[PDB]
């Protein structure tokens, strides 16, 4: 994964969005296309709608999601089995 000496990566626009959302009582979902951003210990509690390719799925950020990327909670491929 990303080198420790460089620190976890986060998109600047998403960082600004979470900064503007945490200080306020804004509980509206934060729509984003940035699946590459690491989940930081500053936005636990609000819902982020991560793009999966064709829509934004809402993930409720908890403590256990810290260190993962936003895309890990937005699957991109639809599968239901063969002849099932």
């Amino acid at each position: 994964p990303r080198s420790l000496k460089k620190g976890p990566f986060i998109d600047l626009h998403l960082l600004k969005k979470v900064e503007k959302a945490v200080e306020s009582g804004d509980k509206k979902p934060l729509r984003t296309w940035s699946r590459r951003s690491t989940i930081f210990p500053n936005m636990i509690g609000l819902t982020i709608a991560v793009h999966n390719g064709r829509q934004h799925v809402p993930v409720f950020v908890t403590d256990e999601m810290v260190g993962h990327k936003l895309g890990e909670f937005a699957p991109t491929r639809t599968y239901r089995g063969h002849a099932a």
Binding site: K6, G7, L12
Partner: protein, 100 residues
């Protein structure tokens, strides 16, 4: 290749040339071992602000006569087909059919 596809490459080359040093010093700051823990963060955030097309890794070598993105050769700047045509016409100095 398409005209738009060739224009994309020329634009990418221009952007990389324009933002060359402004990327190099930011990367040096980020990779600096003895740098602080907040100027590194600022440099990392600033590197994303530059247009993506300014990174040299976005460039794809293309045939300089057709635009073909596959089968490129750096020594001649052309795809394999055009290299063969020029070689047979005798337009590539010193290049002949090899056998050993």
């Amino acid at each position: 290749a398409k005209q738009s596809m060739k224009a994309r490459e020329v634009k990418r080359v221009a952007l990389a040339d324009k933002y060359f040093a402004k990327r190099a010093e930011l990367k040096a700051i980020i990779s600096d071992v003895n740098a602080s823990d907040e100027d590194r963060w600022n440099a990392v955030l600033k590197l994303q602000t530059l247009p993506r097309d300014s990174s040299p890794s976005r460039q794809r070598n293309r045939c300089r006569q057709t635009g073909r993105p596959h089968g490129f050769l750096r020594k001649f700047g052309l795809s394999r087909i055009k290299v063969r045509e020029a070689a047979m016409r005798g337009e590539i100095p010193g290049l002949k059919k090899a056998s050993w």
